Write a protein that binds this ligand. Structure first.
Ligand SMILES: NC[C@H]1O[C@H](O[C@H]2[C@H](O)[C@@H](O[C@H]3O[C@H](CO)[C@@H](O)[C@H](N)[C@H]3O)[C@H](N)C[C@@H]2N)[C@H](N)C[C@@H]1O
Ligand SMILES: NC[C@H]1O[C@H](O[C@H]2[C@H](O)[C@@H](O[C@H]3O[C@H](CO)[C@@H](O)[C@H](N)[C@H]3O)[C@H](N)C[C@@H]2N)[C@H](N)C[C@@H]1O
Ligand SMILES: [Cl-]
Ligand SMILES: [Cl-]
Ligand SMILES: [Cl-]
Ligand SMILES: [K+]
Ligand SMILES: [K+]
Lengths: 147, 145
């Protein structure tokens, strides 16, 4: 319908920032430096969706060559994050973005698209299932300093 | 006891420990193992008691995003298997120590890992090995395809 999706760019950095920061909180300067890197990374995809003149959603994805939990192939496409403004969550925009993300990943001859979500974000689990993802594994991460 | 990297000569020693940890065909395991042997960013250690291989550890340097970490790249613990009769031996501590020395050659400052959510045994082990929990997540997949 009345929506369009385009890759993010320098012209749309402000739009992308607003949405990105609602998903992952950080300083503008930190987000912005990261976003410029992503623009120059061929294995990253960053899409915005518009309704009228308004940015309403964003998707970020990557191509992962390192092992991803739950997958059977490598490389795979990987959903790094998706955010749709609350008032626009009944528009199928998230489906439209994932579809375009899959077309992108196919260029790399990927056959699987993987993703993850925080264990307690059960709403996001429901959203993944609506987008056609099936749960593979639940895991707990650990870390330690060596230096 | 004796900890040494896997080699073309220890490939079967490695395989019959590896296949008890991760499910794959022998053919898939071996093709992967050969590649892993040549990869500078992949570690594979075996431990030997007398002359039996009684444990293995695999690790890597991960350059892509790792949940819960604060730096990148990072060392990453991919798996540890110990034969049941040696699980009270402390061999896993000795393997992890060596894996840290290995990761330090790259100026890594952080060593990460994960475990299945339902593998409470591995959770204890990670803590015993000096790791602290960071994040819990659920993975998903769909065919494109
Ligand atoms: N989308 C769901 C996922 O969100 C996060 O991962 C995501 C990270 O939070 C993202 O990191 C981003 O957000 C974090 C803060 O959360 C910033 O510090 C960082 N600079 C910024 O790039 C990173 N770029 C992508 C990664 N998939 C969770 N760690 C895991 C969760 O399943
Ligand atoms: N150590 C704990 C982890 O074990 C597995 O990950 C591990 C994977 O199972 C390992 O993959 C192995 O096992 C998978 C099957 O599980 C095979 O497809 C693959 N070819 C084979 O190499 C892969 N090479 C390393 C990865 N950390 C679990 N998916 C996650 C768990 O936290
Ligand atoms: Cl989440
Ligand atoms: Cl549901
Ligand atoms: Cl596990
Ligand atoms: K890009
Ligand atoms: K190696």
């Amino acid at each position: 319908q009345g929506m369009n999706i385009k890759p993010a760019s320098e012209a749309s950095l402000k739009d992308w920032l607003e949405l990105r920061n609602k998903l992952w909180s950080d300083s503008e300067a930190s987000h912005l430096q990261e976003m410029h890197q992503l623009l120059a990374e061929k294995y990253a995809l960053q899409l915005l969706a518009y309704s009228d003149h308004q940015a309403i959603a964003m998707l970020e994805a990557s191509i992962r060559f390192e092992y991803v939990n739950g997958t059977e192939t490598s490389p795979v496409g990987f959903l790094e994050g998706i955010y749709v403004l609350p008032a626009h969550r009944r528009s199928g925009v998230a489906t439209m973005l994932i579809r375009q993300a899959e077309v992108w990943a196919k260029q790399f001859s990927c056959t699987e698209f993987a993703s993850d979500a925080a264990l307690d974000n059960v709403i996001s689990h429901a959203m993944h299932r609506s987008l056609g993802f099936q749960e593979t594994e639940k895991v707990v991460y650990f870390s330690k300093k060596i230096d």
